[PDB]
């Protein structure tokens, strides 16, 4: 159980160092050496586009995989004596690949707008692209984690559904309704993403 201790130590040291540096800078009235414009103007929007795409597919992949194994373990446990479970519970793994497609299609939506800049000086060059590629990043991480947790909930709910279906298969749809709700939350995520990528333009 030392790994969580290592993580706690890392986080504590990081946070304490940040606090100490911040209070020291405020104390000595340093002349905007903590320049936000320096942190930001030196940021390529290609980060924003590429990491939006990457997070959008990655988090969806992770959640869909999580639901996949959770349902797999549950169905395999429940089918020991009730093999009629597999007649019905595969809809959960279909929902997991739905969790995947929600992110993949939006990754394509972001990737359609991959363009160059041919601009070097940050000040007042590419003012629109700056907000555009950023917004691609925001929408990408949004839809990614959206599909992620949607897959998580669908999976563990399908686990409960399968272990209930072991003793009686008639109530499976009565349990599947909550999976429909989880899918709806994932759709909310996709909608926020499209509203964040409908007024953007690159290069």
């Amino acid at each position: 159980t030392g790994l969580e201790l290592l993580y706690l130590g890392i986080f504590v040291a990081f946070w304490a160092c940040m606090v100490v540096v911040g209070i020291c800078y405020t104390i000595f009235d340093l002349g905007f050496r903590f320049d936000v414009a320096w942190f930001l103007t030196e940021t390529s929007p290609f980060m924003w586009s590429n990491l939006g795409i990457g997070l959008a597919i990655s988090l969806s992949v992770v959640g869909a995989a999580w639901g996949i194994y959770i349902t797999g373990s549950s169905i395999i446990g429940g089918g020991v004596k009730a093999p009629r479970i597999k007649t019905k519970n595969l809809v959960s793994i279909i929902f997991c690949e739905a969790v995947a497609i929600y992110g993949i299609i939006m990754a394509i939506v972001i990737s359609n707008m991959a363009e160059p800049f041919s601009a070097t000086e940050p000040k007042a060059i590419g003012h629109r692209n700056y907000h555009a590629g950023y917004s691609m990043f925001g929408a990408g991480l949004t839809v990614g984690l959206s599909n992620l947790f949607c897959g998580v909930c669908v999976g563990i709910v399908g686990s409960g559904a399968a272990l209930a279906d072991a003793q009686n298969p008639s109530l499976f749809v009565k349990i599947l309704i909550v999976e429909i709700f989880g899918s709806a939350i994932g759709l909310f995520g996709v909608i926020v993403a499209i509203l964040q990528t409908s007024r953007v333009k690159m290069g």
Partner: protein, 150 residues
Amino acid sequence: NNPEYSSFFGVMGASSAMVFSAMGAAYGTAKSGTGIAAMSVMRPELIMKSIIPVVMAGIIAIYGLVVAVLIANSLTDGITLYRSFLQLGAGLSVGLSGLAAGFAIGIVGDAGVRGTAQQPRLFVGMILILIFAEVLGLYGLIVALILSTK
């Protein structure tokens, strides 16, 4: 004029508006669904009675989503950077308050599972406790609406 990069606050406003709220929603639904799977094992007649926490986790998702859609509608390039502060604050507020209401409705919900499993009478009381949590979610909503349109 508008300082460059000013819209970033508003876009994290939209993200943080919906993200944590949806965490909470899918947590509440998840866990109440497992408890109600146990219910489905032990008796089927209260299945209509078991839909209560889930739709309200959906309500948490709405609390997040309406604000997020508002921000994603107000997005643009040349933002004053003084409305976007309100956008960001509203977003993080409504998001994490949706997370709050989310795990609250979840834990109270699966407590209510067994509580109503053995005693049908406690159904009314546990609904009351549930309603309190979505009042908390609406609280999470309203300041976000105030700030995002201030």
